[model samples]
Each structure stands twice: as structure tokens, then as C-alpha cells.
Target: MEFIKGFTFGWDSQKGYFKTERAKESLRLMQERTASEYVIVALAALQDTAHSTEVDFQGSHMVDDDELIELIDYAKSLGLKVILKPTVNCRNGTWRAHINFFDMDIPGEPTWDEWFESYINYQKHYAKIAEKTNCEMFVVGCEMVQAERREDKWRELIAEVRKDYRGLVTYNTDKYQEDNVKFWDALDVISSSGYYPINDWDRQLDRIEAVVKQYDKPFFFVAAGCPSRSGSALLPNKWDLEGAINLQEQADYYQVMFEKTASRSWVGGFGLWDWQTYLYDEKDATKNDDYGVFGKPAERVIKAYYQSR
Candidate 1:
């Protein structure tokens, strides 16, 4: 059987490209070659909740409605399905957002209620935009590991999103935290990056087989590093090039991971963490230097695996 197939691309204004000729080219490339019905088109807007004083509704950084609409039109024009993912980051005084996105200043009680309220309020706002744009799917939250203890908050958030979106919704989580499985009741679909701790893709299949036991829902997989979101390196060369797995070995690795997951009942699809690359005119800050396929040979390899799936 074929492994699941899909593409994940970006709709960003800050990495400095959504409006550029290159950005247009990037989207066109995925549309032409990738073997998938839809792509997760992310709007690269950073909501630095910790630092920005103008934090709206708990701490959501707002994206301009007009800009969001333009991206939706752009995706529709290409005849591709779009998944609208806006990054909700909790900022600190430094780049360590997960650490500093909260107010540790008031040491007495954790404002869990206030923080969750912010998340629910903002997703509601995003859902309104999705309604206007007719986007395919929406990610309620991405890697907010701290929020796991508060499952009811997510139940309310996605349930509320369901009220408006009438489409798919899922949350991303790091592997090994089976607690994410707790969200199965609230979410429409099960999704995760599936970046197993091991660098060897061949060894990862057993792990893929392992997580399937935790949930009984159909799931989608996006492999590889989450692109300089600050995580472990998968391929050898690191983020400078898409060096997670060499082209020669990529197809087999994907096939094995797919087979292992599909052997279980609920695995619906599998996708590379990215089918294209994240190009910017700035220096690569990711220490691993392997977050992208930029000018790398992995695109052909990625295409081959995507097609095989």
C-alpha cells in the first residue's frame, strides 16, 4: 500500500518572502510536482506574547485580515487545499519563548485560566478568518507542551473552532508525550511531527508502530525537524542543508516509516515535515544548520518518496 502523501509550505511575511517573487515560485513548485491534494500553508506571523505589550486577549499577536485573505486567494488560485497555521509563541526577554512566554513575575499562582482563555479567544479569531478565506484546515495549537495538563481548555478551544470551521482541526506535539493522546476526544484528527529521538529513519519505524497504540484515531505524520523551532537534528548535515537523510536513503526510510505506521489501523497519511524549503535573505540561526532543503538535493528525494506514498 502507498504511504500517506502531503506537503507543508509557508505563508510568511516576516522571514521576508511571502510577497517576493521567490515565495510565489516556492508555492508554484509544490503545486506542480508534489503528489498531494493539499498542503499546510502556514502564515509566518509570530505572536510574541511575552514581550509585546499590545497582547490582545491574553496574548495573541494579531495578523492583518487583509493579508490573510490575500494568502487564501493565493492558495485557491493554485488549486491546492490550504491549512492555515499561525504560530502562537509565548515570548520571553530572550529567544527562549517556551521558557519566557508566561509571567513568572507573579510567583504566587500560575494564571492557567487566564492563559487558556487567551488561547481559546485567539483561535476563535483565527476561525473567523478561516471562514472568510475558506481555508481547508486549521491547527489549534503547535507544540505548546505546557498546556497538556489542561485538556479541558483544548476541548473547549477545538469544540468552539468546530462551531465555525466545519473542517479538520488538530494539534502538533513532540513524540514520547503520550499525554497528547488525551486530546483525541476533542480533536477532529490526530496529528504530530513524529520526529522520533533517533536520527536513523530505519530505526524510527518501530517507534512509529509504538505511538499508534496510544490512540485509536486515524493520524497524519509530518516527519523531519520542525524547521529551526529549536529541536534535535534528524539528518546528518543539520539545518544548513536538508541533511536529515541522504537522498539515496530517503525513499527507503519513508517507505519503512509508512509501512510500519500503516500496518496499524489508524494511520491515514504521512508527509515530509516540508516538501519545499524555507528560504530567507538572512543568516541561518539554527545551530544544526539542517532545517531546510534550500539549494539541497533533497527535493528530488522528497518528491520521490511523496509520489511513492
Candidate 2:
């Protein structure tokens, strides 16, 4: 078994995602499958504190007070480091209906301070979560770029947080906005999803190195997406399967991606973006697929390469 330094488990608690032992068992299997040394498992939960009423087909939530502690203990019992990620996505329909920062504030939604405080307090709760679970790391934010810029606000908020959580703190950011990673330097490590766009596939390694150099932080990478059909600032169109990995060509996208990244001294390690299959019918042509070390055959290639390294 290889040392699985990092693993991710993102599921919807509001939709009854992790309630049964099936999800728990799935996590156990992931650790077993990946030989993971650090596994972050999310307990099924909903957020009533703030954004309690937002809208999405799959409702957003915060982990419940009790389950958060239990999840920490459960993972530790398995000898895995835990990373707590309390998601705050909104449900379908309603004034505030979406995930990400856009959902938290609307015309009649909580005032900026009110909304901000709600989120801050919700994050602050992790101090207790970390202390009680003896967890190693806790994610303070997830891709909420707008909130990160208020450096003074974050400084005050982190001051409040440090009172509780004494462990490593980090937040995942959108790759293009490397500036966002610098705002919360008070946190232990800087992390961002590693989705560098593939322009000329030949320059892939050079572009990735540039990103790491520009940020100048210990980092992780996850190349789990291409341009969505709807398009994003980074991706313009869905890539062909060969464009993604080119397995037949003996090309390993993620393998080469991580190898190139970890070669840089500043990089700590990397994890596949996600590691679960969905029960719901696929929606977005671009995003509605399993993007994990376990699901994708190419991922095994990547993991094998890491182990060899």
C-alpha cells in the first residue's frame, strides 16, 4: 500500500447523501483503495445557521454540530488525517438560489454584514469541530473569491477563529485567481484547485510551472475539468477524451500534471478534484461525470506514477 497523502469526499448532506453506512463504507473503501494517509470525509448535514434558506435543486447545507465531531473521530480512528469542509450551497428556486458567493446575498437576503457575519460565525464554529475531533486541517473557505478580498475583514474573522481551531487552516480557490490565495496568509497553507487550461498541449508543463511560480506557495492540483459546454472564464469548450488524457497515446494528463507540479519545490502535494459517482441523472455535459482517482482509469495511471515517484 502506498501512502495516500490527501483524499477528498464532497457530497450533499441535505439530499441524505451520507446518512447511511453506504457512504461511510464508500469512504472506508476509498482509503483502502487509495491507501490514503489523510482522508477528509464529510458527515451528512444541513446549515440552519446561515444561508439556511437558499435555493438549488440540491439544497445547500452546513454540517450539523454533532455529526461534525463524530466524522472527525471516525476518520481518526482509521488513522487518517481529517479535513473538514462544511459546504454552504443554496437550494433550487427562491431569491437566494445558487452556490458560491452569488447565492448568499440577494435583494431581500441578509445584509452584507448580516450575511458576512453569518458565514463568519459558521466558519468560526470549526474551532470547536477541530478541537473536539482532533482533526489536522480545516477549510475556512471554498472558492468564495469575493469574500477573501476583504483582508481586514478576514484578519478580524481569523482572529476570532484562531481562538478555537489550533490546527492547520486552508481554503481551496479557483486557479485563475491566484491573488485570492494571498488574502488569508494567516492560514497555514495556500491551496487552490489546479485546473490550468490546456491551450497548446505541448506547453502544458511550462504553463503549469508558471502558475506555481507566480503563486509561490506549496500547492495541490486537480485537472478534473475542461471547458464546460456553458463555458467558464478558464475553459472555452469541452475537451475530447484524448484531449483530456490520451491514454491510448500513452499520455497521462494528471500523471504528467502532478509530476510537473510536485517537481516544483513549493508544491506540497495534489489530490484528484473529486472521488465519487453520482446517483442523480447527469445534467451538465461538462461537469456531470465522476472525476476521481478511483473512477477514471487514467487516475490509476496517475496514482501509479506517484507511487513510483
Candidate 3:
């Protein structure tokens, strides 16, 4: 319930990525470099086929459950609140937001009903784990844009997740899709990816504030970041844009973003786009222009902002 100064860690971290020592080092670096009080540890569940309804959670792509548990404990030991975000990705090089089904079943294709069954199973598995670990929040899903229109199924899934996890429940919708989700009232908190253009923050926040007031729910940016590329501040939501390394651009984006959101009381805080379990060397960080703040001037901006709060 507190202002969640957060970062997304171990995103789709592979085998052996969550070793106790490595996790501790990652946490230490986060605290040293930023003012993070919460860490959203993402656990990915892959679907064997991109367009298919069935989700393959038991596959090797997901972080091992035991390692995830240990990492959660380690974060808690460091006095950081943990939010378990069980996200699904496509194994066939497609985005999970594109995972969809027909409203009416076709004989040869999958149906929404079948997809929701698998999705519910996948989410419930993690919900129980979240309960067992006493995570501060359980993000049932992340950016499944195409699937969000299935309101009845989503309500059912939320109901099921609540049966197992007693903490706050949220779903991370993609950028620009905040006003479209029909079930915000069912979620304990409303969250979305805040990848709006750097200059468009005021306009977008105005739009989101109306939804927050309508639902009467506390809200936060579950995922928010801009790359360090030269043109990224104008198109922060576009990951595929190619440009030169521009550390100052990234820093400026964070500075303005923090300044703007700091005034919105309905806005809780952010789980910054990412940090890695195995970090790049600080000496080489300038050459990188991904969403990460590590070893960059934006890292200092974040630390100073969180500390001031």
C-alpha cells in the first residue's frame, strides 16, 4: 500500500540465474544504485505454440519454481516487498499480447473457452505460490491485450486467483489500453505500462486519471521505462527503434516522468521496466541503450527521486 519504489528483476531469467549469491548481488546493486523498496520478480510461462490456446507452463522456459521461491525470500531478507508477476510469452517468436481466440469456435481452431481454461490453470499455479511465499501482490497476467476483451473469463480468473492469494491482485495492461479494460473494479489495484511519449505524459495521465476516478481504485504504473537511444524519449513505447546511445535522453525522460507522476496522488509508483540478474559491467554501460537504468545517469536520477520520496 506504500509508495512502491520498484524495479522488475530476473525477467525471464533462465536456468541457474537465480542462485542465492547472484540474487543477493542483484538486490545489493538495486539498493546501491536506485531507491527501490519493491522488486517485481517476473516468472515467464511460455506457450508451446504462439497462436494456440494451450499454455505450456511446465516447460523449461519458465524460471524454476524452487529458485523463484528462494529469490523471493532473498528479496524479503533485503527488506524489499515482493510482487510475483507470472507472465506468459509465446515460444514461436510472437508476443503474448497477440495470443487470441475466436468468439465462436471453429472445428479446426482453438476456442476462447479452451484458452481460458489453460490460462486459469497457469495463473492459479502461481497464485498458490504467491500465497505460500506471502508476496505483497500477485499480478495475474501482463499485457495480454488481445485477451483482455474476454471479460467473463477474466472475472473468473480473478475470482480463482483470489481464492488462493489474499494479497493485492492486479493485471498489467499494455500502454494506451488502460481505458479499454472492462474489469478494473474487480482488481485490487489498476496498473498499466506507462510507455507514453515523453512529451505526452500530461495528456495521457489526464486520460488515465479519469479511469482511476471512475473505478475508485488506487493505481500505479506496473511497467514504465524508456530506452537510452537518441530518439527513445519521443517513442518510449517502441522497443524496435534504432538509434545512437543517448544516456542523457534516458535521464531526462526519467526526470520528467518522476516530476510529473509525483504530483498525482492516485498514482502509486512504478516497477521500472527492468534490471538484470547478471548485469553488464559498469564500464560498458554507456554503449547499451536498452530500458535498463544500470550504470547510467538515469540510475542516479531514479535513486535521487526515490530517496526524496
Candidate 4:
């Protein structure tokens, strides 16, 4: 499998976020400072509720097409392979995994088909951008758990996406869901969030290894990072885990992750959770407790591991 020296950047960024001097500086930092060769740029189209059948990608909440195109051009100019991912989320703050309706449609109720229609359009819009800008891949959606069960709709969407975008296509499933997506055979790649506790990677990688072998596909942790806080390594997936900032804990988690997964050759590469479009001052980096590794000990660990790659 080919490796992706990658990380996600500028998720849910609005129209103006990618056009700033700060964004340019941050992208350069991500390249020279972090040693990442690929960047996954994600945006979201909003629905009023998880169950709402309508997806609005044209609203002010989304990045404008012109800006998005230019941002892709700039990223390519920096020699970073781009993966454009367009995701769906609820405006009401519900987790997207719960975005579901009755498996059997009831009259007067929203149906899965209704939702899939809107979702198809939303994905196709960005798939075109991804193709025109020569992105390496197009991640159709991220962590939409309940929606994955509708195998027929997902297959249809993937076929539709192929019509417009010729690049490799994949979906970013949440952690523990690598085996649950029955439509993996329809995609060119497989990816998941890797936020397992620092101690649990051995078993989880064992489980994911089988999936990679079963489907005969390349796989990667499209999203993975621990907050720079105390005890975050134990519960890296829990962003709300209350604790003091401890940058070394985050670094330690990355170290263990590399050691454990290194033996598994099917593991493509790590796409660290994210880097902000506007980064904080490097002098203040150790003070931040979010998932971003910039200017922290974890940042060094990332460079060390990726440097070897």
C-alpha cells in the first residue's frame, strides 16, 4: 500500500478562512515544520436537524466555490497532495452518527431516499472541485455512522461520485466502525478515525488488519490525534476529558501509536486530526491544549516519525 504523509487541515472553515495570510503561513508550516506530504481539506454542508432531509451547501456557513478552488490551487502549489472531503453535520449540534430515520419509510415521515438525494448532490459538488484541482482522493463523508447501514444508497452515491470524479474515493468512518461499512468493496481506499486509548491500539489494529485484508484495500487513519492535556492518552477520543495541559502526554501517545502500528504494513499512513487555518504563535504553542500538535512536543514526535517516512 502507498503511504500518505498527511494530516487534515481547515475543517469547517468558512469562506474567508482560507484566503488569509495566516492560512498561507499555516499551510507552509504544515509542510516545512510538520513533514506532511498530503493535506485533507474538509468542509461541511449543514442540515437544520439530524433528521432533516435537506442539505444546504450553498449557505453562508460553507466556503465559497472560488475561494475553495484557490485554496486547492495554493495547496497544490506548496506540493501537498490534496484530498477534498465534504461532510454533513447538523446545525442543531447533534452528532451526525445519529442522523437517521426509520429503516422502513413511514408515510408523512422523512425517508432515507430523500436524505440520500440531497447528500448525493452535496458530495458531487465538491467531487468536481476535487477532480478539477487534481486532488489525490475524495473522501465522500466523515463518520456518518447510522447512514452507513443503507448499503444500497451508499453504493449508489459512490457510483454517482465516480461519474464526476475519477480519483480514488473513500469515506472516513469513525473508530470501531472499520468492519461495519459493508460497501468497502465499492471504494478505492479505506480510512477511519484512530482515537483509541494509548494502551488499546494492539487489539484495535488486530481488528482493523483483518478488514484491510478481507477487502484487499489500502487503509489509513484519516483522523487521529490526542489533545495536549493530562490523561488524554488514556481517552484520546474524548475531547472533553477534563484535565490540565500536558503536552508530553500527547507526544507519548503518538510514540506508542507508531511503535504498535509499525509492524502492520497494510497501515497506509497517519492523517493527524488537524491543523488550524490560522495557527497560534509558536511561542504560545505549548500553552494550547487542543488536538493541534503545532509548536508542542507532539509536533516534534510527528516530525520524528514522519521524517523516517
Clashes of each: 11, 7, 0, 0
Residues 1-309, model 4: lDDT tens digits: 568889889874887877788788888998887899999887889999999999999987787888888888999899899888789889998888889999898999999999999999999888888888889999988888889899999999999999999999999999999999999999999999888899899899999998899876799998888999998998887888899989989999999998888788989997888898878888999799998888888888888888887
What local lDDT does model 3 show for residue 257?
A: 95
Off by over 4 Å in 3: none
- Which pairs of residues have clashing backbones in candidate 4? none
Worst 10 residues of 2 by lDDT: 91-100
lDDT of 3: 0.88
- What would the C-alpha RMSD of candidate 3 be, to one decimal place? 1.3
TM-score of 1: 0.71
lDDT tens readout by residue for model 2, 47-161: 3433343211222354455554655576677887777654354322211112223433467655445555766766676667786777777666665555555566666766777
* TM-score-best of 1 and 2: 1
Cα lDDT tens digits for candidate 1, 239-261: 34333334334333444455455
| Decreasing lDDT order of the candidates | 4, 3, 1, 2
lDDT of 3 by residue, 1-309 (tens): 678899999884886678658667977898778979999888787776657777777866666778878888888888999988988877777878888877788898888888889889999999988899999998988888988999999999999999998999999999889999999889999999898888988999999999898876779999999999999999887777899999999999999999999999888999998898878888989899888888899999999999988
Tell me each candidate's RMSD, in Å, in order: 5.7, 6.6, 1.3, 1.2
Candidate 2: regions farther than 4 A off: 1-4, 15-19, 42-63, 92-110, 180-182, 199-217, 221-252, 277-288, 293-295
Runs of candidate 4 exceeding 4 Å displacement: none
- Please give the distance, in angstroms, between residue 299's alpha carbon in candidate 3 and its true position after superposition: 0.2
Model with the higher lDDT, candidate 2 or 3: 3
